[PDB]
Design a protein around this nucleic acid. Structure first.
Length: 150
RNA sequence: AAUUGAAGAGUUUGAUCAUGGCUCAGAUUGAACGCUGGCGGCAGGCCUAACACAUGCAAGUCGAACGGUAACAGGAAGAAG
């Protein structure tokens, strides 16, 4: 049920007095298959060290996303840093058809149908979080019955 | 029952995030060239010189408009081997 996966890994540099020392950072997103979306970045001097902290941080900071059946309740716009993310429900249509960075967050959230097409900046670390912000701000037709109806 | 569907990647820097061009994955064509090549069905086939042309053919048809025997097909009459 853990359903965890990595998006991408990127080598970086420091350049201290002695010379260049290269660290590694692996982005990861996790989910239970029905809502409960979460993610983690982290860093380390090794590849297996950095991925471990990413999956470790992905356990905490997990929030529910509301879905109808196996689809979104409505289309929702979301932005983060310099990235701009749109999505459409498209009920049982073709499905989970999207490029890397945003592929992980949709499939692990539970959606096997919605279309992405992420505009603006397509940076792996900025394109993620635009989903979680765009899925957190999304509200549910059953639980908006507080404002709706009466 | 009927225009119900939306992907990204690479590259500036010691490394990073924007901005921003270039490049690639797709489909398509009245196509060509390179290499190769079994059959069938359907469709397509001078996109440049509206440059110029050999030869045949590409529009004739009515004797039930009319005077007519020029053809060969008979019939009729005549003259002969």
């Amino acid at each position: 049920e853990l359903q965890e996966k990595l998006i991408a890994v990127n080598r970086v540099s420091k350049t201290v007095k002695g010379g260049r020392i290269f660290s590694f950072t692996a982005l990861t997103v996790v989910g239970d298959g029905n809502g409960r979306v979460g993610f983690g970045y982290g860093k380390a001097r090794e590849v297996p060290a950095a991925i471990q902290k990413a999956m470790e941080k992905a356990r905490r900071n997990m929030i529910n996303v509301a879905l109808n059946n196996g689809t979104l309740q409505h289309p929702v716009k979301g932005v983060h840093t310099g990235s701009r993310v749109f999505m459409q429900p498209a009920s049982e249509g073709t499905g989970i058809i999207a490029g890397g960075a945003m592929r992980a967050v949709l499939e692990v959230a539970g959606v096997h149908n919605v279309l992405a097409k992420a505009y603006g900046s397509t940076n792996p670390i900025n394109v993620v979080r635009a989903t979680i912000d765009g899925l957190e701000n999304m509200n549910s037709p059953e639980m908006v019955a507080a404002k709706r109806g009466k």
